[PDB]
Design a protein around this ligand. Structure first.
Ligand SMILES: [Mg+2]
Ligand SMILES: [Mg+2]
Ligand SMILES: [Mg+2]
Ligand SMILES: [Mg+2]
Ligand SMILES: [Mg+2]
Ligand SMILES: [Mg+2]
Ligand SMILES: [Mg+2]
Ligand SMILES: [Mg+2]
Ligand SMILES: [Mg+2]
Ligand SMILES: [Mg+2]
Ligand SMILES: [Mg+2]
Ligand SMILES: [Zn+2]
Lengths: 136, 99, 107, 96, 23, 116, 63, 122, 97, 86, 45
RNA sequence: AAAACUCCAGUUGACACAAAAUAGACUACGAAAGUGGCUUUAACAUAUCUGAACACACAAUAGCUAAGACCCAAACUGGGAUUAGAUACCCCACUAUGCUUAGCCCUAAACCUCAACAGUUCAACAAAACUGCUCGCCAGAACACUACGAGCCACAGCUUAAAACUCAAA
């Protein structure tokens, strides 16, 4: 038993967490860029609870794009959520850039419980053509 | 390629040798060997199958002849003069059980 | 140019078609079917007109007719599609082939 | 005379393997079948090694899928979650 | 193979271009 | 099934563009490659981080955060142990795949023959 | 050989025999071999052609 | 040639839908068609949201229309469809049943592609 | 007097045909703890191994029953001018006798 | 964007393991081929270069698979020297 | 044969008189094309 | 890391004349250049072969003219870094240009550096070795994708293409 695949918005899945449906549970948007990760927390109706990033917490510069920084950011986000009453979170990932799992970890530490992880990293089906290949 | 005249055919991709042909060849080869033996000639059995090394050695022992079923060093025949003394009698015939 | 309401090269020999429904007739007409059927019809007509033995297509004459038809088709296509260069190329080569055939015939 | 062999049409040859989908007819209207050869998570079309199809068949499937995606019969960035409880044709790890 | 025969040619071409630009 | 190389390489026979243009000749050799490991690892960072945070929160003392520091130390020790264990293991006897040397030996025993 | 087809047919019908094949001793007779022999006995002069012949052979075996 | 019109309507009660159907068919007829059969494929939830012209939709009825028509009319038909309000989209594909399947013998096993390199000791 | 062709015709290896899934009998002639060297007639030997079920019964000389999965085990690889044989048959143990 | 929001490439978690779920997700991505694409779509890989890369890949696959097959064939032949002495 | 088949078909084609009713019928009914293949070569709905 | 941006960033809606994941472990179509989002229409010369460097029709990208579109990319240019210097490599910005329509230009490592058709089973590297037949081309290096002449919607161009001087090599 237990499916990997999520419960659809169509009815009726016999699941709740804190007496709430899957769609009702808030989303924590993690934007893992290559040199900073920003972690928003939002309700099901799209009301923002708590923004927090590696810039907002202390760090500046390349030290934004470490895992530790990401973790810290996540923790901060969790803390902010806690005041407003959240507990369980869906997680949504954007991009790659070390602070991606780290953010999640931070969130967990902060006390929020991870319910699901979905990465909507924008993979353009050939859209804009990116920067020229630099000399490393 | 160079065993196609001696092959009969192939039964489900498994090749079968012409037994008549083998017999014909055998009659020659064995006869030759016998002749060599008669003429006080050194016969040398050779192999590298391992499975049959012991057997070959035994065979060599039983007859007046010899064997070399082990790793063939570089120049047991071409360099003989050095690997043994200067006055060696090389094999006057050789037999491979496994070429 | 053959009329649009004419039957196909396929559904011509068959018997009952002469006294059949109108919709059915329309369905089995050049007007509905694609340009290739029309081309075929044209070829047939040409054969009827000119060649001594229709139902051959191995003799030079028949081949020439076909070539001519193809050329015509190409020309029609190139009325529009004036940037289509492949078709132009096809036309040009095909005309030369036709010319060659004609020469051979003459010889 | 008699007992020599006779050249003969290759017996014990088991008839060649089938696509699974060989006699079948694939339409963009049929989402089910098409859905079956898409990854549930990404909505990406499975390869040939994964799907296990003849080349013609595979091509037919892929074109059909594409048609569905444009003509609005099928989803694109995922495989429809109503069609997960169906026969698994494809050979795939993830989950273990 | 080498890229040694090409290089000379390239150089020559460049020089020619320069000359053209000048004059 | 291995992907075919039927009409792929630019050869005298083909009426095609080459599908592949390989810089090494596709003739599988009598060796297999050497094995690999490790990277910019940085073990036990999470453990470190919590301790650091605790320190920041307090004055800067051991006495306040003695239960986190100890944990961190333990983690470090474990990591150290694990490295040793790893060393003992994958160079001596791999559980699953073979050691490369053994594989090489095997290959040598039944080597590939293009040279006819 | 001409019996090969027959053997193949037998295999298709009746799975590779539960009777174990020897290979060590010469003149071993497998079930397939027996069937083939029966067929030979029947045709020539069975005269009923393939499927019918096969059926007849089967019947004989059963008896 | 035979054709299919993959019609995707609303989602707007029966009578309206019927009217729309009547309209579309009429247009086709005018263009020069012989419509053959009608195949309603339910009102299913649309696999993505699909933007008109002027409203964006989530639910939508599906209909297929089998029809013979002249080659020139198709573009016109398409244009008409584009113009018409209550169609979410109307793509027109030539009928699958036109193409008879070639009878497959099946996948054949491809061997090792051989004699790619010369006999050299290297 | 016999020919060769005739002999071939009425010999067990030709009587059977293809070796794929054919319950055959054959003796074991050599032993190294786990593995069992089994002769089943034919060109090569094969090896299977001692099962848990009556391991102390499979001794040198005894008869065993093989499933037989081909007679020779060969294959040609990327750069090979000839397929590389193993000199073994590949045949799975059913049991004894 | 115009699709439904929580179906594509989501992974549900059981009893708050989380890390495991993440790993699974990663694996899935790898299988699909998305991560690689993302890595490559960071910069524009010019057509010729792309083609070259593809060629390299396909050749590698051909080689590697063959090697694997060979290994499989030859794993039968690790036992012990059965004839030993000699 | 083909012609005959066509003729047979034709009586059931929608014309301007036999239209509204046909439409209504279509609306009422539902054909479905969603057959879904198994691992072996077999169809299921 | 400076600089840049804070009219910024994230979630959510609404949202293209740009570009077309996966399928593609397939190897197709075209004469080559080239061509993998979807639909419809039209549509892929030649029942011998070879054959224009006096023809005609094509010919990536870049480039020219004229008018449109302009997300993203980006020569040039500007700013920041780096360095003894940096007219580069790294960063950021932005333009011609890439796109559309109508004309030009006519070159590529235009290379699968392996001519067309018919047929067969060793210098060395590379993609084994050859027959028949045809056309094209080549005959020391460099001078020289030069000079002069000629033709070209090309005027800094393209195509064709020398000689001297030199050297015992390349
Ligand atoms: Mg190379
Ligand atoms: Mg010619
Ligand atoms: Mg020319
Ligand atoms: Mg611009
Ligand atoms: Mg820009
Ligand atoms: Mg465009
Ligand atoms: Mg151009
Ligand atoms: Mg030219
Ligand atoms: Mg090219
Ligand atoms: Mg060349
Ligand atoms: Mg030529
Ligand atoms: Zn098939």
């Amino acid at each position: 038993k237990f499916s990997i695949y999520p419960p659809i918005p169509g009815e009726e899945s016999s699941l709740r967490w804190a007496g709430k449906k899957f769609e009702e549970i808030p989303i924590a948007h993690i934007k893992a860029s290559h040199n900073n990760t920003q972690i928003q927390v939002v309700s099901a109706s799209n009301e923002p609870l708590a923004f927090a990033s590696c810039g907002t917490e202390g760090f500046r510069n390349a030290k934004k794009g470490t895992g530790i920084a990401a973790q810290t950011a996540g923790i901060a986000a969790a803390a902010r959520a806690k005041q407003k009453g959240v507990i369980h979170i869906r997680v949504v990932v954007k991009g790659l850039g070390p602070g991606r799992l780290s953010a999640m970890h931070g969130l967990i530490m902060g006390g929020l419980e991870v319910i699901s992880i979905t990465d909507n990293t924008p993979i353009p089906h050939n859209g804009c053509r990116p920067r020229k290949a630099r000399k490393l | 390629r160079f065993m196609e005249p001696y092959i009969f055919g192939s039964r489900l991709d498994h090749d079968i040798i012409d037994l008549e042909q083998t017999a014909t060849h055998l009659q020659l080869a064995l006869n030759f060997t016998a002749h060599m033996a008669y003429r006080k000639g050194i016969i040398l059995f050779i192999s590298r199958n391992r499975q049959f090394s012991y057997l070959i050695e035994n065979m060599a022992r039983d007859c007046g002849e010899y064997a070399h079923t082990r790793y063939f060093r570089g120049g047991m025949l071409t360099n003989a003069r050095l690997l043994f003394g200067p006055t060696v009698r090389l094999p006057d015939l050789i037999i491979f059980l496994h070429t | 140019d053959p009329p649009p309401s004419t039957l196909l090269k396929d559904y011509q020999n068959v018997p009952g078609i002469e006294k059949v429904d109108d919709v059915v007739k329309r369905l089995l007409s050049l007007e509905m079917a694609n340009k290739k059927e029309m081309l075929k019809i044209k070829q047939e007509q040409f054969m009827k007109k000119i060649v001594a033995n229709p139902e051959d297509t191995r003799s030079l004459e028949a081949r020439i007719i076909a070539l001519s038809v193809k050329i015509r088709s190409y020309e029609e296509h190139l009325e529009k599609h004036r940037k289509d260069k492949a078709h132009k190329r096809y036309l040009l080569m095909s005309i030369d082939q036709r010319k060659k055939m004609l020469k051979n015939l003459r010889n | 005379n008699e007992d020599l062999p006779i050249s003969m049409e290759n017996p014990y040859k088991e008839p060649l393997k089938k696509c699974i989908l060989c006699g079948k007819h694939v339409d963009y209207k049929n989402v089910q079948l098409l859905s079956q050869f898409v990854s549930p998570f990404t909505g990406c079309i499975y390869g040939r090694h994964i799907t296990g199809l003849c080349g013609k068949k595979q091509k037919e499937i892929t074109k059909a899928i594409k048609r569905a995606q444009i003509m609005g019969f099928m989803p694109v960035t995922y495989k429809d979650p109503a069609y997960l409880k169906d026969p698994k044709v494809c050979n795939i790890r993830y989950r273990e | 193979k080498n890229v040694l025969k090409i290089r000379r040619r390239k150089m020559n071409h460049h020089k020619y271009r320069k000359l053209v630009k000048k004059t | 099934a291995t992907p075919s190389l039927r009409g792929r390489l630019a050869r005298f026979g083909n009426p095609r563009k080459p599908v592949l243009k390989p810089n090494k000749p596709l003739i599988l050799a009598n060796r297999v490659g050497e094995r690999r490991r490790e990277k910019g690892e940085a073990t036990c960072i999470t453990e470190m981080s919590v301790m650091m945070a605790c320190w920041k929160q307090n004055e800067f003392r051991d006495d306040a955060c003695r239960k986190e520091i100890q944990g961190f130390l333990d983690c470090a020790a474990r990591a150290q142990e694990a490295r040793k264990m790893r060393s003992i293991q994958e160079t001596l006897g791999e559980s699953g795949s073979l050691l490369p040397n053994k594989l090489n030996k095997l290959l040598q025993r039944f080597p590939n023959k293009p040279y006819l | 050989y001409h019996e090969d087809r027959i053997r193949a047919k037998f295999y298709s019908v009746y799975g590779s025999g539960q009777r174990a094949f020897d290979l060590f001793n010469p003149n071993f007779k497998s079930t397939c071999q027996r069937f083939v022999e029966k067929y030979t006995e029947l045709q020539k002069l069975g005269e009923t052609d393939e499927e019918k012949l096969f059926v007849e052979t089967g019947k004989a075996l059963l008896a | 040639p035979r054709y299919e019109l993959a019609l995707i309507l609303k989602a707007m009660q029966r009578p309206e839908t019927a009217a729309t159907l009547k309209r579309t068919i009429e247009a086709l007829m005018d263009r020069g068609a012989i419509v053959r059969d009608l195949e309603n494929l339910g009102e299913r939830a649309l696999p993505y949201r699909i933007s008109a012209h002027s409203q964006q939709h989530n639910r939508g009825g599906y209909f297929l229309v089998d029809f013979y028509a002249p080659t020139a009319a198709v573009e016109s038909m398409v244009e008409h469809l584009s113009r018409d309000i209550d169609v979410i989209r109307g793509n027109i594909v030539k009928h699958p049943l036109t193409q008879e399947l070639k009878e497959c013998e099946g996948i054949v096993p491809v061997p090792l592609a051989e004699k790619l390199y010369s006999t050299k000791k290297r | 007097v016999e020919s060769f062709a005739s002999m071939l015709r009425h010999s067990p290896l030709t009587q059977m045909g293809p070796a794929k899934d054919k319950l055959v009998i054959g003796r074991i002639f050599h032993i190294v703890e786990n593995d069992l060297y089994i002769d089943f007639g034919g060109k090569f030997h094969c090896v299977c191994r001692r099962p848990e079920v009556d391991g102390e019964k499979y001794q040198k000389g005894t008869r065993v029953r093989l499933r037989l999965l081909d007679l020779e085990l060969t294959s040609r690889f990327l750069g090979a001018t000839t397929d590389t044989t193993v000199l073994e048959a590949n045949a799975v143990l059913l049991g004894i006798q | 964007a115009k699709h439904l929001k929580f179906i594509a490439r989501t992974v549900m978690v059981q009893e708050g393991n989380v890390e495991s779920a993440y790993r699974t997700l990663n694996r899935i991505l790898t299988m699909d081929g998305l991560i690689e694409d993302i890595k490559h779509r960071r910069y524009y890989e010019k057509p010729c270069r792309r083609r070259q890369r593809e060629s390299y890949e396909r050749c590698r696959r051909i080689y590697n698979m063959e090697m694997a097959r060979k290994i499989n064939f030859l794993m039968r032949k690790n036992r012990a020297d059965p004839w030993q002495g000699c | 044969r083909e012609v005959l088949q066509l003729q047979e078909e034709v009586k059931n084609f929608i014309t301007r008189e036999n239209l509204e009713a046909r439409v209504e019928a279509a609306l009422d009914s539902r054909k479905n094309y969603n057959w879904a293949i198994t691992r072996e070569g077999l169809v299921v709905r």
